[PDB]
Design a protein around this nucleic acid. Structure first.
Ligand SMILES: *O[C@H]1[C@@H](O)[C@H](n2cnc3c(=O)[nH]c(N)nc32)O[C@@H]1COP(=O)(O)OP(=O)(O)OP(=O)(O)O
Ligand SMILES: C[S@@+](CC[C@H](N)C(=O)[O-])C[C@H]1O[C@@H](n2cnc3c(N)ncnc32)[C@H](O)[C@@H]1O
Ligand SMILES: [Zn+2]
Ligand SMILES: [Zn+2]
Lengths: 284, 704
RNA sequence: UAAAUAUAGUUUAAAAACAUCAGAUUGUGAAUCUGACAACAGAGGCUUACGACCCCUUAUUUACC
């Protein structure tokens, strides 16, 4: 193809192009309509290899050091099988969560407003968001709504979870949140909501849009929450925090962590700790 | 600090790069009567402005033309149409933190800078270096400027023409070809000799002599463009026979890409001028800026007026816009672009369009606008008529309600009072005041200027008297058209205003022959009887304006700040207060006034900011009117924070209202004013819901 | 409107550290092993390249006499 040599010459120009690239990555570069998009995408691949090789050089160093130390070189109550034990313990809590835990909904209706770069990141935060829920004392009953089976988000989640996807203790479905819970008990959280949330109510269902807008798209969730007559709310960031830098749209992992602390009787002092410190110059 | 200075210092002596990648020529002012003529040059490393006229800064601020990056401002003539409005331009640069700005043009610029220091104060913080045409050629990272002084057959006969020349840009370097030839590429094996092949220098490699130009694309020789102004007929002959111009037109190795023509229609049709224009060659494009260009510059002002016109057509009148030649030319248009590098072409994509139909539709689709307007229309149009049918005069036209600097919606303070159909006076004259007058009346501007009886200046702040000269020259032109004899205008202003005009008169251009200034000190109550010459001028003011009394006082503002109070033989009294805090002297003078025009710069809760800034808040201004017992209160001189509408305090009664640009108010409209608020809130619902969030944020931030 | 800023797990400084996901029946350095994900707001440009340089959008914080 004409694109293959297109890259090789860029290698002669030293356009920060990686050494080895799979054909799968080549067609992704094909989709790039602009040279700057190709320039940006290639740099991402280049740093991808740089971290891996630096990772590997520092990795074989670990093996070499450990084996050398070994060459130079009772009564127990429990066997060292802790990692397995915690996984089972979290599973039991997770099973209880889906029978009695408060429903937390992740809305997956934003797939049309996401590029591939942001769609990948959304799954990364979704993995972390669910990870923190599992380790929590009182996990939420996480709901994955509007998750099309053939959609990109569903396919990406399967690859990152592999066989664990079918064993996760969460409800994943194609039906909208309005079809699962009463419309009067649903609060669509969003930074653009004119209403400021003061108290975490345990009888309400909170909807978090699984949307990562690196290219800012204000009001996307508000329009969704206004097309259907659903209440909206926003965190009291300005009320308590001296915001100075950055955007007020927090990450999904931070969002669920903030809600998790609030649901555990924590006050705004503890709950808002998870907001990045670089964004605010103190608390009050 | 600023970003651009760091980038410049990073490049060092313009190293690591040649000329700018792209350089285009954009028109900011098409040359209309209201907006004047101006030209804007864009480049990767530098930006230049030509003929900074009155209101030019407003246009650049409105059309996303960044001001914090300008380097030089070129003036083709020392005439208020070209240097006027420059004072406000300098302040804008100072606010942005620009360290130095270079001015080029006639050698009268240095005297003008010290002339503006009388009222503008010290220009500390920004270095003003005047570069007269006698100075050597100016060299930049982008282009060289040749200043040509032209003298017609201080100095009023001097016109400066600029012959710019873009520097040669190094061509692209073909990496693929060099490697095949046997030139290693990569690491230090390419870094040293890549510059040599890029700079056009022959390089020797392993005994092989390689010409740099061979392995690189043909470098751009550097397009040249000319900016020339021909004010009148007396300037054609010197321009045609100028020796310097001949070096760029008849020659074949020094082509001219473009030639800006800031000349009237009569000059262009001249036979001598036509031959000179053709002498540049058929390959030279010609751009003309004059009054023939019909275009809309203040698009936002037109848009908002059309939306407001729906509420009340009379109170919100719609704005009205004011030959085959051998050599073809392109008529100037706002935002019209002419690229000079890398392609020579006319870029017409950025030209704005003024179609009202979109504006009306946009207003109607708003949530509660149409319903509110319809509700008000039936309650007023079909409602009971007032028992007292007041006369159609006096009518107050609020040409400007700005505080410090003009913006898209609000211009600096300026109010026109029409005492009768054949007489009027201006209560204030800020920068661009004439432009508002021309826009508000169009073809009727000359008639209105002919009825101008007197002009009042509250104080020496630049936002109150910087537009007076523009009125004088335009009034002189307007009077000549009607054939009326030319007589000096009556100006009421502080004594120190003479120094700024006297300095300008003796160094820049004769303007005092249009002025018969009455000091504001002798017009106060119980004031000492001045010289008989001043006394007869006072008698003229009352007679010409048909005013029973013209009072004045000292308001709580900067030193030598005065208010106003108009009394008419009929009985109605109009009281105007410039920038002032709540003052007791104003209350005594304006007692039982018919209409009150009071400053409302700041909102509620900004009381502390008002005393330091020496102004009044919305509630403070309203309370003054009630203390004065005025039949109605008009608020103007709003801060630029409330660009569209000020915050509506709960104290707003039926005797108060806000002011808008190009807004006509008559004594018979007072009962209607309270009913116009609900439609205004719907129209400005978005701006209304954004202003109080800052107030909510303000309280928390100060509390913190 | 203008000027500085913007790290999508979080910080540091101009690439790392601590975290995240999958697999592990671990003899108590699992304090590990084999994988997954590594985009310093976004988009479009310039250049042999540069995180440089240059426009445009959104967002944040200040100022708007
Ligand atoms: O462009 C701004 C600006 O001119 C003015 N404005 C609004 N808030 C402020 C402020 O706090 N301080 C200053 N100096 N100027 C302010 O109003 C305009 C607001 O821009 P918008 O795009 O939001 O308004 P609109 O919906 O009418 O569209 P547009 O045509 O002006 O872009
Ligand atoms: C990072 S935000 C991005 C989407 C954003 N709401 C928009 O419309 O562009 C992703 C999700 O986190 C939640 N969220 C982010 N910041 C929030 C805040 N400050 N208050 C409440 N919810 C927030 C929102 O519900 C949103 O669906
Ligand atoms: Zn003022
Ligand atoms: Zn003032």
């Amino acid at each position: 193809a004409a694109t293959r040599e297109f890259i090789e010459m860029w290698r002669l120009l030293g356009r920060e192009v990686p050494e080895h690239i799979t054909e799968e990555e080549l067609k992704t570069l094909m989709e790039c309509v602009s040279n700057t998009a190709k320039k940006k995408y290639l740099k991402y691949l280049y740093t991808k290899e740089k971290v891996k090789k630096a990772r590997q050089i520092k990795k074989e160093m670990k093996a070499a050091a450990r084996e050398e130390a070994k060459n130079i070189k009772k009564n127990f109550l429990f066997l060292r099988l802790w990692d397995r034990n915690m996984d089972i313990a979290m599973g039991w809590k997770g099973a209880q969560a889906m029978q009695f835990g408060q429903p937390l909904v992740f809305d997956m209706a934003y797939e049309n407003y996401m590029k591939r770069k942001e769609l990948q990141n959304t799954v990364s935060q979704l993995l972390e968001s669910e990870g923190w829920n599992r380790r929590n004392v009182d996990p939420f009953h996480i709901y994955f709504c509007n998750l099309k089976i053939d959609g990109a988000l569903h396919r990406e989640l399967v690859k990152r979870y592999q066989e664990k996807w079918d064993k996760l203790l969460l409800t994943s479905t194609e039906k909208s949140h309005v079809d699962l819970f009463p419309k009067d008990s649903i609060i669509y959280l969003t930074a653009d909501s004119p209403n400021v949330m003061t108290t975490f109510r345990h009888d309400k269902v909170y909807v978090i849009g699984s949307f990562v807008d690196k290219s800012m798209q204000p009001g996307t969730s508000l329009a969704k929450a206004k097309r259907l007559n659903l209440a909206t709310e926003c965190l009291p960031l300005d009320k308590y925090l001296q915001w100075e830098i950055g955007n007020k749209n927090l990450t999904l992992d931070q969002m669920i962590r903030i809600l998790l602390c609030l649901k555990n009787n924590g006050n705004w002092q503890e709950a808002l700790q998870f907001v990045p410190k670089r964004k605010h110059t103190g608390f009050l | 600090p600023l970003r651009h200075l760091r980038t410049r210092e990073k490049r060092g002596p313009s190293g690591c790069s040649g000329g700018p990648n792209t350089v285009y020529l954009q028109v900011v002012a098409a040359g209309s009567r209201d907006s004047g003529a101006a030209l804007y040059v864009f480049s990767e490393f530098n930006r230049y402005l030509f003929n900074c006229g009155e209101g030019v800064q407003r246009l650049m601020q409105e059309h996303k033309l960044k001001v914090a990056r300008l380097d030089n401002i070129f003036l083709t003539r020392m005439h208020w149409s070209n240097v006027g409005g420059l004072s406000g331009m300098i302040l804008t640069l100072k606010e942005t933190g620009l360290p130095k700005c270079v001015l080029s043009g006639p050698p009268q610029l240095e005297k003008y800078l010290e002339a503006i220091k009388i009222f503008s104060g010290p220009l500390k913080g920004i270095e003003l270096a005047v570069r007269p045409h006698s100075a050597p050629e100016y060299e930049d990272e982008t282009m060289t400027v040749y200043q040509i002084p032209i003298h017609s057959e201080r100095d009023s006969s001097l016109v400066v023409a600029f012959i710019c020349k873009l520097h040669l840009k190094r061509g692209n370097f073909l990496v693929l070809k060099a490697k095949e030839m046997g030139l290693p590429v990569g690491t230090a094996a390419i870094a040293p000799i890549i510059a040599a092949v890029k700079d056009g220098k022959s390089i020797t490699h392993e005994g092989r002599e390689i010409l740099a130009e061979e392995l690189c694309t043909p470098p751009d020789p550097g397009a040249a463009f000319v900016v020339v102004e021909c004010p009148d007929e007396s300037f054609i002959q010197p321009i045609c026979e100028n020796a310097t111009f001949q070096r760029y037109q008849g020659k074949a190795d020094a082509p001219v890409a473009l030639v800006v023509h800031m000349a009237p229609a009569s000059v262009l049709v001249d036979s001598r001028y036509q031959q000179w224009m053709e002498r540049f060659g058929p390959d030279t494009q010609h751009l003309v800026l004059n009054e023939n260009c019909a275009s809309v510059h203040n698009l936002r002002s037109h848009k908002i007026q059309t939306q407001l016109n729906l509420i009340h057509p009379d109170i919100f009148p719609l704005l009205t816009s004011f030959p085959t030649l051998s050599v073809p030319m392109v008529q100037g248009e706002c935002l019209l672009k002419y690229q000079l590098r890398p392609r020579r072409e006319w870029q017409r994509d950025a030209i704005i369009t003024c179609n009202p139909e979109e504006f009306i539709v946009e207003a109607l689709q708003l949530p509660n606008f149409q319903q509110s307007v319809q509700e008000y229309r039936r309650s007023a149009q079909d409602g009971p008529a007032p028992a007292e049918k007041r006369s159609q005069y006096p009518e107050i036209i609020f040409l400007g309600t700005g505080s410090a600097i003009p913006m898209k919606i609000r211009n600096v303070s300026a109010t026109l009072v029409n005492i009768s159909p054949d007489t009027s006076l201006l209560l204030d004259c800020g920068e661009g005041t004439f432009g508002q007058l021309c826009r508000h009346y169009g073809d009727q501007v000359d008639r209105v200027l002919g009825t101008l009886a007197a002009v009042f200046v509250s104080h020496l702040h630049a936002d109150h008297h910087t537009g007076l000269p523009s009125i004088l020259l335009q009034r002189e032109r307007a009077l000549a058209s009607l054939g009326k004899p030319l007589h000096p205008l009556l100006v009421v202003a502080p004594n120190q205003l003479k120094a700024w005009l006297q300095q300008y008169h003796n160094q820049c251009q004769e303007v005092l022959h249009h002025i018969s200034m009455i000091p504001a000190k002798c017009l106060q109550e119980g004031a000492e009887i001045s010289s008989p010459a001043v006394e007869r001028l006072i008698s003229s003011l009352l007679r010409t304006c048909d005013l029973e009394e013209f009072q004045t006082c000292l308001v709580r503002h900067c030193k030598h700040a005065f208010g106003c109070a108009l009394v008419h033989t009929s009985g109605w009294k109009v009281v105007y207060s410039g920038d002032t805090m709540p003052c007791e002297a104003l209350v005594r003078m304006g007692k039982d006034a018919t209409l009150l025009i009071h400053e409302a710069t700041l909102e509620d809760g900004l009381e502390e900011e008002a005393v330091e800034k020496t102004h009044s808040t919305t509630s403070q201004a309203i309370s003054v009117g009630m203390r004065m017992n005025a039949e109605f209160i008009m608020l103007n001189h709003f801060s630029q924070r409330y660009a569209k509408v000020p915050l509506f305090s709960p104290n707003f009664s039926e005797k108060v209202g806000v002011a808008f640009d190009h807004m006509k108010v008559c004594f018979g409209d007072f009962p209607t004013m309270p009913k116009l608020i609900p439609p205004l809130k719907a129209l400005f619902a978005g701006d209304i819901e954004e202003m109080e969030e800052r107030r909510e944020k303000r309280e928390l931030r100060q509390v913190r």
